[PDB]
């Protein structure tokens, strides 16, 4: 009907309808969304987080690492240390 009212009815119910289904929908798409933004977010928080745990972590690996470099380090200081103890 071309003569139907096109304006919105302000007399519609403005309150939230409690009879809406409170159960979560199983028909929601379970696949990952490729249309999500792949760019890094510049609006993230650049400040440090004091809420991070300040306590030492006991779950760190206590075993000696075999993947440490076994070759000698040429970048060590070749100069004789003047701060070595000069006493007897």
């Amino acid at each position: 009907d071309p003569n139907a009212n096109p304006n919105v009815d302000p007399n519609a119910n403005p309150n939230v309808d409690p009879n809406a289904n409170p159960n979560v929908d199983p028909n929601a798409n379970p696949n990952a969304n490729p249309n999500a933004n792949p760019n890094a977010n510049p609006n993230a928080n650049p400040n440090a987080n004091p809420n991070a745990n300040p306590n030492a972590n006991p779950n760190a690996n206590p075993n000696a690492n075999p993947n440490a470099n076994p070759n000698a380090n040429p970048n060590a200081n070749p100069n004789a240390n003047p701060n070595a103890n000069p006493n007897a």
Epitope: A32, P34, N35, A36, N37, P38, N39, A40, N41, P42, N43
Partner: antibody, heavy 124, light 106 residues
Framework: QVQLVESGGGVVQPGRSLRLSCAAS????????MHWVRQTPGKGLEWVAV????????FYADSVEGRFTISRDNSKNMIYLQMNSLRVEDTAIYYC?????????????????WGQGTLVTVSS | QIVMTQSPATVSVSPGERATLSCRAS??????LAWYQQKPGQAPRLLIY???TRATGIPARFSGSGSGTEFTLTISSLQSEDFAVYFC????????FGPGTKVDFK
């Protein structure tokens, strides 16, 4: 000055593997997600794959799902595309495309900047 | 996903007049639709992104408009280097391209 150049193109036989590489310069590479876009004459432009900024998520097209593999190295500013189990339907020019002109949270997925493209031919 | 169609396949205009290219999607893509221009032997170039926003460096001649399932790409007064193929992409759901539209000398 954003320049994208591709390499690794050539001619391969069906059922074999080819590796395309794309070099990126002129921008912070690790802040943007890169795409591979395919152009086959007679079919039009076609999308292939996408990779997140740090490579956490990778999404491939249906026609290439399970055969192609996209990766990246933010320390070399290069984008790769491993094309395993190639078929005759994969003969096309492959472009290296960057997503978006700049960062907009609600507007992403369009290819602002394209590379010159490389040719991959599958035949015997 | 969404299949994009462009009509007409080719449009013939002489330099100086007004050229309009139409893009239609099977399902609504809201306002996520980019236009690309590809010259022979060249890679595609982003002209218009979103639904009307113009990429940096694009002259104000290229005017984009439309939303939902009916989009148009309008060229105000075509020059000689604007003869190329124009592609229509939607990035609302997946990433699909149109077949492309040719603009040629009349």
């Amino acid at each position: 000055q954003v320049q994208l150049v591709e390499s690794g193109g050539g001619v391969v036989q069906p059922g074999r593997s080819l590796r395309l590489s794309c070099a990126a310069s002129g921008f912070t590479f690790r802040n943007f997600g890169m795409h591979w876009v395919r152009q086959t004459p007679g079919k039009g432009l076609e999308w292939v794959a996408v990779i997140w900024h740090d490579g956490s998520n990778k999404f491939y097209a249906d026609s290439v799902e399970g055969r192609f593999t996209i990766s990246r190295d933010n320390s070399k500013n290069m984008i790769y595309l491993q094309m395993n189990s190639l078929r005759v339907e994969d003969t096309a020019i492959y472009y290296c495309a960057r997503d978006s002109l700049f960062y907009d949270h609600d507007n992403s997925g369009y290819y602002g900047y394209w590379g010159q493209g490389t040719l991959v031919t599958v035949s015997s | 996903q969404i299949v994009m169609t462009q009509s007409p396949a080719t449009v013939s205009v002489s330099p100086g007049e007004r050229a309009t290219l139409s893009c239609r999607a099977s399902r609504s893509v809201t306002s996520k639709l980019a236009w690309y221009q590809q010259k022979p032997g060249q890679a595609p170039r982003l002209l218009i992104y979103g639904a009307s926003t113009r990429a940096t460096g694009i002259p104000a001649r290229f005017s984009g408009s439309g939303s939902g399932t009916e989009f148009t790409l309008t060229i105000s007064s075509l020059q000689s280097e604007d003869f190329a193929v124009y592609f229509c992409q939607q990035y609302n759901n997946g990433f699909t391209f149109g077949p492309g539209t040719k603009v040629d000398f009349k």
